[PDB]
């Protein structure tokens, strides 16, 4: 249908149906140094995003529902105003100051879950 980033500008609800379009393009004699640096950098960025998904308990998923509630202080926009009337570029700008807060909450939540699972599995 659309190529890489062809969904940009569409609403978030529409853009979410093309997630593999972008996921598949990640990772895809002095002048050999530029080529190696370019290749290594692509790998490092890929791995950092994957590491976070691992830490947050979203490894292997494109869509991951978690146990961290949404705070209206980050944004109080209605879901019909977010998913149908905004694109992802706009959304990213709207909440760009809260991503560190959210990320900290996501990793802490998963850490607590790791510990609760371990204890339940210790019962016979």
């Amino acid at each position: 249908s659309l190529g890489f980033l062809g969904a940009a500008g569409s609403t978030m609800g529409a853009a979410s149906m093309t997630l593999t379009v972008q996921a598949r393009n990640l990772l895809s004699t002095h002048w050999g140094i530029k080529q190696l640096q370019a290749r290594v950098l692509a790998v490092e960025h890929y791995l950092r995003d994957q590491q976070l998904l691992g830490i947050w308990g979203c490894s292997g998923k494109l869509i991951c529902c978690t146990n961290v509630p949404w705070n209206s202080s980050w944004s109080n926009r209605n879901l019909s105003e977010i998913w149908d009337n905004m694109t992802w570029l706009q959304w990213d700008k709207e909440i760009s100051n809260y991503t560190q807060i959210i990320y900290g909450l996501l990793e802490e939540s998963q850490n607590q879950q790791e510990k609760n699972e371990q204890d339940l599995l210790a019962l016979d």
């Binding site: 659309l2 190529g3 890489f4 980033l5 062809g6 969904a7 940009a8 500008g9 569409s10 978030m12 853009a15 979410s16 093309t18 997630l19 593999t20 379009v21 972008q22 996921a23 393009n25 990640l26 990772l27 895809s28 002095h30 002048w31 530029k34 080529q35 640096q37 370019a38 290749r39 950098l41 692509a42 960025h45 995003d49 976070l52 998904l53 947050w56 998923k61 494109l62 869509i63 991951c64 529902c65 978690t66 146990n67 961290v68 509630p69 949404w70 944004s75 879901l79 977010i82 998913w83 694109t87 992802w88 570029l89 959304w91 990213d92 909440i95 991503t99 959210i102 909450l105 996501l106």
Partner: protein
């Protein structure tokens, strides 16, 4: 009520700077070192996306500049050095077939050169173009002897530009501006995504831009700040102006061995009449073209003002004169015949006289000189003027003069449509699911 949901593969990006690599389909651009291209390249139109572009803050320009210089220098690494040539020369004038245009332009110089055995010498004579030779006190020396060493360019390596495509690494993308009448700094309502730029020819010139892209609807005038005087104005033309350049002399090229495996090339003689190099521009086309430029300048300077064109005020030949590589020779053409008019609200050509130099200092550097060996026979090349670089003088009359000199402004005329962004696939949004 709502929960955080993490999404990966989200179509967003950020302005970013990364290192780009080249793709390219014996050449001073070492294109054999570049990646083969995609025969069916993709371009993805982005509907409802408006981006901010700024051609004056575009780091692609800086990378092209650095790669061009590095490729240039690498091509000279294995070539014969001419250290043995920096000797006192004994020179007289070439007066045999002078049409009075060339009086004093060519000098006949003899010298003692080294040879294959270090205990032997040979007497050699050759012709030089004056601009390359300076007087010592009939004693002359090459102009570079008190500043820099000379490396002879390899005679087998072409200087002809080959289009180079700049490609982003995975995780990055290049956004292209598709709007017409785009001035280089505003928002661009119509954009598309590509992985590689179109090929750009690394044409080197100093006042007029040659063999670039044309504007499609009108002449477009771009500048960082049009009301300043400290900035150059880049004018992109809608139609090409054809220019015919020649070095109408039949050269006989001779060579000698100056050491083990070291050959030196020089002009031995000239057959027939000796005439000046020159370029032809049609008057009718030029007049219409310049008139179009004036019309567009009036949008910023007034419909009741006077627009005057004049010659560059002074400075080094590389700045005041229009320089280019034509068939391997380096020409310095006088454009005073193109910018000599005041605009107030046929087969008749313009002849621009040109000078030739063999000792060349490129990229405005000091200490690295190149010797361009002569080309045998007669040289003719035809090229397109696709743009201009002008400056404005610091009443009711504005005056514009040829500018240029700084190579980064030539590349800005091709790279203005592109920007590099980083893809940021991971992000969050509220929704109804939890787990």
């Amino acid at each position: 009520n709502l929960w955080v949901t993490v999404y990966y593969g989200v179509p967003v990006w950020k302005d970013a700077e990364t290192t780009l690599f080249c793709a390219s389909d014996h050449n001073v651009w070492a294109t054999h070192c570049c990646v083969p291209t995609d025969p069916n390249p993709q371009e993805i139109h982005l509907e409802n996306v408006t981006e901010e572009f700024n051609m004056w803050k575009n780091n692609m320009v800086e990378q092209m500049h650095e790669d061009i210089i590095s490729l240039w220098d690498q091509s000279l690494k294995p070539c014969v050095k001419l250290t043995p040539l920096c000797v006192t020369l004994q020179c007289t004038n070439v007066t045999n077939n002078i049409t009075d245009d060339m009086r004093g332009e060519l000098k006949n110089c003899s010298f003692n050169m080294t040879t294959e055995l270090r205990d032997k010498k040979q007497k050699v004579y050759s012709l030089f173009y004056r601009l390359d030779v300076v007087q010592i006190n009939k004693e002359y020396r090459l102009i570079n002897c008190n500043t820099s060493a000379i490396t002879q360019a390899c005679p087998k390596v072409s200087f002809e530009p080959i289009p180079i495509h700049y490609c982003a690494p995975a995780g990055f993308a290049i956004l292209k501006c598709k709007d017409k009448k785009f001035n280089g700094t505003g928002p661009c309502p119509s954009v598309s995504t590509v992985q590689c730029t179109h090929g750009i020819k690394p044409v080197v010139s100093t006042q007029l831009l040659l063999n670039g892209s044309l504007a499609e609807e009108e002449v477009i005038i771009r500048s960082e700040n049009i009301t300043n005087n400290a900035k150059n104005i880049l004018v992109q033309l809608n139609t090409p102006v054809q220019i015919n350049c020649t070095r109408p002399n039949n050269n006989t090229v001779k060579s000698i061995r100056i050491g083990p495996g070291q050959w030196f090339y020089y002009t031995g003689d000239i057959i027939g009449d000796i005439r000046q190099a020159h370029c032809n521009v049609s008057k009718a086309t030029w007049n219409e073209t310049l008139g179009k430029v004036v019309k567009q300048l009036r949008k910023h300077f007034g419909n009741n003002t006077i627009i005057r064109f004049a010659q560059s005020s002074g400075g080094d030949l590389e700045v005041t004169t229009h320089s280019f590589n034509c068939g391997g020779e380096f020409f310095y053409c006088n454009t005073s015949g193109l910018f000599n008019s005041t605009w107030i609200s046929s087969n008749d050509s313009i002849t621009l006289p040109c000078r030739i130099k063999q000792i060349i200092n490129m990229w405005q550097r000091i200490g690295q000189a190149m010797y361009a060996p002569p080309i045998q026979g007669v040289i003719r090349c035809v090229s397109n003027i696709t743009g201009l670089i002008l400056t404005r003088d610091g009443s009711t009359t504005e005056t514009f003069r040829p500018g240029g000199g700084d190579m980064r402004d030539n590349w800005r005329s091709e790279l203005y449509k592109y920007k590099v962004v980083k893809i940021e696939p991971l992000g969050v949004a509220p929704t109804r699911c939890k787990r």
